[PDB]
């Protein structure tokens, strides 16, 4: 109850923070998916500008 | 009381600036109606 002596649990808590940093590290953010559509637009526009400079 | 108070301003001088910013955030279509009101035409004549 008023328990005692403490040599227990606290060494078994930091092994747990090797688990939770393994699972939650492999998550996906919805926002990152909206960023890859932006750089694809500017690249072909500059490639068309490279084709416009191939005209001009 | 605010920062425009206690520094020597008037509420018209407040209302001129905050309404001018709305006429700058408008598009190209509704810019003529910001040119329409645009009430800077009255001249100032004081005898001294």
């Amino acid at each position: 109850d008023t328990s005692t002596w403490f040599i227990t649990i606290t060494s078994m808590i930091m092994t747990l923070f090797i688990l939770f940093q393994l699972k939650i590290s492999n998550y996906s953010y919805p926002a990152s998916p909206e960023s890859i559509e932006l750089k694809t637009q500017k690249h072909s526009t500059p490639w068309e500008m490279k084709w416009t400079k191939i005209y001009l | 009381v605010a920062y425009w108070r206690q520094a020597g301003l008037s509420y018209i001088r407040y209302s001129q600036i905050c309404a001018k910013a709305v006429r700058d955030a408008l598009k190209a279509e509704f810019k003529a109606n910001a040119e329409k009101t645009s009430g800077s035409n009255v001249k100032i004549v004081k005898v001294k």
Partner: protein
């Protein structure tokens, strides 16, 4: 509150008939039920062994988890909704990607 005490008492007249119609479903199992009476003994023998204690708060932490099964039939839409919302973005993206590539050629 005069109207609210009858509102549970009208539910008391409602739950006694809904328990009666549920008692009619067991009357349809007067002959054909061979499932529960195989396993109703182990919960009658172990309850004759040890299982009584200060754990009437065992049911109330299992009773509240029944009320959330009600809203879980709406959690299928939110869960379902998340999948559909997720699905629309890729569809928009492929179409968007496709038009740009073809017209640049």
């Amino acid at each position: 509150p005069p109207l609210p005490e009858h509102g549970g008492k009208v539910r008391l007249g409602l739950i006694p008939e809904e328990f009666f119609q549920f008692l009619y479903p067991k009357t349809g199992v007067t002959g054909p039920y061979v499932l529960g009476t195989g396993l109703i003994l182990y919960l009658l023998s172990k309850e004759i062994y040890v299982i009584t204690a200060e754990t009437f708060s065992a049911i109330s932490t299992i009773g509240v988890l029944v009320y959330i099964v009600k809203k879980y039939g709406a959690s299928i839409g939110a869960f379902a909704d998340k999948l559909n919302e997720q699905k629309i973005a890729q569809l928009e993206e492929v179409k968007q990607a496709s038009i740009k590539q073809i017209q640049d050629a």
